[PDB]
Amino acid sequence: DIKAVAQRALSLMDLTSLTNTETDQEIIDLCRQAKSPAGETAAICIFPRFIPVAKKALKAQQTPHIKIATVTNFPQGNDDLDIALAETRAAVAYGADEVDLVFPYRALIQGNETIGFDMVKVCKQACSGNAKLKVIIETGELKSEELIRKASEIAINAGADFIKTSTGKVAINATPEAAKVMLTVIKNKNTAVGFKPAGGVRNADDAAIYLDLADNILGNEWADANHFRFGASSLLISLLDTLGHK
Amino acid sequence: SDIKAVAQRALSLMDLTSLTNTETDQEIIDLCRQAKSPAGETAAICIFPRFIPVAKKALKAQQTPHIKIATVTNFPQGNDDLDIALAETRAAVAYGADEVDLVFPYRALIQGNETIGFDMVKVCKQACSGNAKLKVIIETGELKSEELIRKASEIAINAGADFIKTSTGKVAINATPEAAKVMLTVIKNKNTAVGFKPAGGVRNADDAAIYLDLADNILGNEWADANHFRFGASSLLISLLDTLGHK
């Protein structure tokens, strides 16, 4: 049932806007859009400086349960620990519920597994008692199964609450192949860790591919809002269309 | 005053500013480079909060640790939402700001709400405790009247402002001699430890002399060092260096 899929995917969305030129009105408008005719998305995902305005709008429309996710070390995934930590500290101070941190994947590709652990760990510590930490490993740039698995393992060891496939800002983002690798790592290490495919999920058919992977690898009941998110934007209109809201 | 001497004096009091909100890392590094000028270092740079970590790294790499990093919050609108201004100020501190330039809720003051201005400046001052100085932009170009400019200054100072600053640079009217005179007089009458920062429309040494002469005459010759006086400006630097004969 494609409508059941669409309804389920909508409730797991991190409704994303990351143009870096948003106006405050566009952020208010995004929060309004997250309060959809078929229900609320799980979250929004926006740049840190927009969090106070978003928190205010979400509260005014009586949907404070819609989480505010943001991004740090983004999009490049540089290997500078001081900068990533400063941004994550600021994201928390802005009022973020969740921080989507970009893993230093280029450093990993060059054989440095240590900076990735260190960066994820100190940023996790900075979120303590305030926010969840998602870690973006950028699977489209890691390419190989070995690297995708390895980044996933390091991120979980260092304390990630979610592992996320992509920034959305590179050539290749979420893929079924990458998703299967990451979901499998989650199963083998810690089923408490969530999974977030981002970029390339545009309709209910795409959503079903990733939901079916999660259901088949981790069980039918695993992928709730605490364990599964879609990083997406245009997906919401497509899902609403599928659900009969043109 | 001697115009070249003023140029030299004014340069060391600059908060070299870039607030386009479309800067890249490279433009921030370049701003830091410019602040290390052939005539001496500016007192600070002033940039949006998210650029502070890159600026910090760049300032360290060119070995200019004493150039402070200032930023802006509640900016530029000066809205009267305390929670938003507080959260931005906390983030600015978390990013690593040395100084936070907060916009006072001046439209609320114009409508007769004097309390929100006090409360907002105070909680933001508290958020800076141990980490940063708080400057308060009262937007004199919008307050317009001497009475409102004096009142916003008094409120900012009572609530704990380390500096009072004339303008955001984002409205039609910014620093003016008239506004400066009122603000410097309030400082003189309430607390000479509070600094003054004319900002916006200061484009050359002639402009700078106006504000330095006012400070000198009202508070004394020794008063306006970098702890008590800043110029909020950008293209001013190039103008001063040209006046000083530097390339």
Determine phi and psi for A31, rounding to 5 degrees: -65, -40
Q: Which of B14, B9, B6 is nearest to B44 (CA)?
A: B14
Chain A touched by B123 (CB under 8 Å): no
Contact B114, B148 (CB under 8 A): no
Which stretches of A67-193 are assigned E, i.e. beta strand?
67-72, 98-102, 132-136, 162-164
Contact B10, B236 (CB under 8 A): yes
The interface residues of chain B toward chain A in range 70-109, judged by CB-CB distance below 8 A, are 81, 83-84, 87-88, 90-96
Distance set, CA B194 to CA A200, B146, B154, B224 (Å): 55, 19, 11, 11
Contact A96, A74 (CB under 8 A): no
- A147-153: long-range pairs with CB below 8 Å, 24+: A147/A105, A147/A108, A147/A109, A148/A178, A148/A181, A148/A182, A149/A181, A149/A182, A149/A184, A149/A185, A150/A108, A150/A113, A151/A103, A151/A105, A151/A108, A151/A116, A152/A181, A152/A182, A152/A185, A152/A186, A153/A185, A153/A189
The angle formed by the CA atoms of residues A49, A158 and A79, to the nearest 5 degrees, is: 60
Chain B touched by A205 (CB under 8 Å): no
DSSP per-residue codes, A34-49: HEETTEE-SEEE--GG
Q: Which amino acid is at A159?
A: G
Q: Give A164's strand partners.
A: A136, A196
Q: What is the C-alpha separation between B223 and B221, in angstroms, rounded?
A: 6
Q: Which amino acid is at B88?
A: E
Residue A163 has, within 13 A of its CA and on its CB side, a CA count of 30
Q: What is the CATH number of the domain that holds B47?
A: 3.20.20.70
Judge: B84–A48 Cβ closer than 8 Å, yes or no: no
> What does the block give as tokens for A53?
């305005």
Contact A73, A101 (CB under 8 A): yes
Q: What is the C-alpha separation between B191 and B207, in angstroms, rounded?
A: 26
Rg (CA), chain A: 17
Strand-pair category, A230-232 with B14-17 = unpaired
- One of B101, B122, B125, B133 is an active-site residue; which one? B101
Q: Which of A56, A86, A93 lies nearest to residue B90, judging by beta carbons?
A: A93
Which stretches of A137-241 are assigned E, i.e. beta strand?
162-164, 194-196, 230-232
Q: Which of B48, B57, B81 lies nearest to residue A56, judging by beta carbons?
A: B81
Domain count for chain B, please give it: 1
Residue B231: which H helix or E strand, with range? strand B231-233
Resolution stated for this PDB structure, in Å: 2.1
How was this model experimentally determined? Answer: X-ray
Domain that holds residue B144: 1-247
